[PDB]
Design a protein around this ligand. Structure first.
Ligand SMILES: *Cc1cc2c(cc1C)nc1c(=O)[nH]c(=O)nc-1n2C[C@H](O)[C@H](O)[C@H](O)COP(=O)(O)OP(=O)(O)OC[C@H]1O[C@@H](n2cnc3c(N)ncnc32)[C@H](O)[C@@H]1O
Length: 431
């Protein structure tokens, strides 16, 4: 008979990242014995190459699939109420802006979706630049002519790296096992009679456990064969440095986002503003054999800034981010960004997660397909990964997250175009 929860060992591969750390946290909260939980990652939590290892991420409700509502409301509750997470949510609001006929129309129906989901109380439609300027006076009336926006009072930003670090300190304090670098870089599951019984890492270390969760983010489809269910893509950011006096003016600013321009956050405690552009992401295709492939594979394999710290971003991305600064912060349009880097996610065709047992390898569970929208789910997502492990996952979540090679084209996903490839986007490589 299977061991009880208290005696069930679980390896979380990618446990130094977002979904992995959340899964480990929820194993412990659910009453798995901490010393039976092993967190393996290529890098110490929060992993240097985790998409969650950043200054900030946006918190808000965005409804791309039906399950998104439950998941966002769960996350919102915990960012507000959970003592582990609360201090890292800054509830400054989110300004979701659009300009142009198409983008405005899409935003208007998006607003109605929020209303229809029951969130009328915390979302307001701003129908002119004058209304936007009321919610953030530091935007330039010259740059935002003809813009409209949704203002979400319940949104804001998340101190992402700090939050994962706090989870790591919880796990450490509880007695969770850690393996990093050579001792944490997964290469293969260990299989016996079609059951997964552990993993082996690049340095030959073998870990044995009753269950294994693969929460390896953008690396997931590089590590095991996923039949193009997830296609990994990079997005980009840069940092600019403000004087203390400049930074003080921006204190408690709402997050500002425009799907056609990018987004930016208030300065952190060091006076640094992080800026992203917005675009369909970049692949980096190369020949690579994930465990379980039965033919030659060309797949998008992350070019990791952690492994290649002299990398920056494509020239085109430097241009686009600078255009975002010129639009959002014209007074800063001549600052030189630094710490430019690529940040990796993996898209499913429908932008819902991939959280399911492997169809052949019993007790090996996928927990990936983050689709560029999942940091905000740090507090809660692990709860549902545990439910999946235990066979108690609700039908709607399980269906949305199921193994689905048939589902569609992840290279385009729900985005405006198929991602371009870093091979065709010069300027990031300084080898
Ligand atoms: C890139 C990005 C993403 C992003 C964003 C802006 C950028 C530039 N803005 C967001 C926002 O405003 N709000 C939001 O909610 N999300 C936003 N995103 C997306 C978000 O960052 C991601 O969706 C999410 O963080 C991904 O979580 P996931 O757990 O899937 O991925 P990860 O945190 O990168 O963790 C993966 C871990 O796996 C480890 N790894 C890799 N290979 C191995 C091996 N071989 N063995 C063991 N571990 C491995 C990595 O080290 C990593 O820690």
């Amino acid at each position: 008979m299977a061991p009880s929860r208290a005696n069930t060992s679980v390896i979380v591969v990618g446990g130094g990242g977002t979904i992995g750390s959340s899964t480990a946290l929820h194993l412990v909260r659910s009453g798995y014995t901490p010393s039976n939980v092993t967190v393996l990652d290529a890098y110490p939590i929060p992993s240097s190459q985790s998409a969650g290892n950043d200054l900030n991420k946006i918190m808000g409700v965005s409804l791309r699939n039906p399950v998104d509502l439950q998941l966002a409301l769960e996350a919102r509750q915990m960012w507000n109420e959970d003592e582990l997470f609360k201090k890292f949510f800054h509830n400054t609001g989110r300004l979701d802006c659009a300009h142009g006929e198409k983008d405005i129309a899409d935003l208007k129906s998006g607003y109605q979706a929020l209303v229809d989901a029951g969130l009328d109380a915390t979302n307001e439609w701003l129908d002119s630049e004058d209304e936007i300027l009321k919610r953030m006076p530091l935007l330039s009336r010259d740059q935002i002519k003809g813009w409209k926006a949704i203002f979400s009072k319940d949104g804001g930003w998340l101190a992402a790296a700090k939050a994962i670090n706090a989870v790591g300190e919880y796990l450490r304090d509880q007695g969770v096992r850690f393996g990093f670098y050579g001792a944490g870089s997964f290469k293969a599951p260990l299989l016996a009679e079609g059951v997964c019984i552990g993993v082996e890492t690049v340095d030959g270390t073998r870990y044995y456990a009753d269950k294994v969760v693969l929460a390896a983010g953008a690396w997931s489809p590089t590590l095991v064969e996923l039949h193009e269910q997830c296609v990994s893509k990079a997005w980009v950011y840069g940092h600019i440095q403000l004087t203390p006096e400049e930074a003080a003016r921006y204190k408690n600013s709402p997050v500002v986002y425009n799907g056609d321009v990018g987004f930016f956050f208030e300065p952190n405690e060091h006076g640094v503003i992080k800026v992203c552009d917005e675009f369909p992401g970049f692949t980096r295709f190369k020949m690579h054999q994930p465990f379980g492939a039965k033919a030659p594979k060309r797949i998008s394999v992350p070019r990791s800034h952690a492994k290649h710290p002299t990398d920056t971003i494509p020239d085109a991305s430097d241009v686009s981010i600078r255009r975002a600064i010129a639009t959002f912060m014209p007074q800063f349009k001549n600052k030189k960004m630094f710490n430019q880097a690529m940040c990796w996610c993996t898209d499913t065709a429908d932008a819902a997660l991939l959280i399911c047992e492997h169809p052949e390898w019993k007790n090996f569970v996928l927990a990936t397909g983050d689709s560029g929208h999942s940091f905000k789910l740090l507090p809660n997502i692990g709860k549902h990964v545990v439910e999946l492990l235990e066979g108690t996952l609700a039908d709607d979540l399980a269906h949305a997250w199921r193994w689905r090679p048939g589902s569609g084209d992840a290279l385009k996903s729900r985005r405006s175009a198929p991602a371009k490839d870093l091979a065709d986007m010069p300027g990031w490589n300084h080898d």
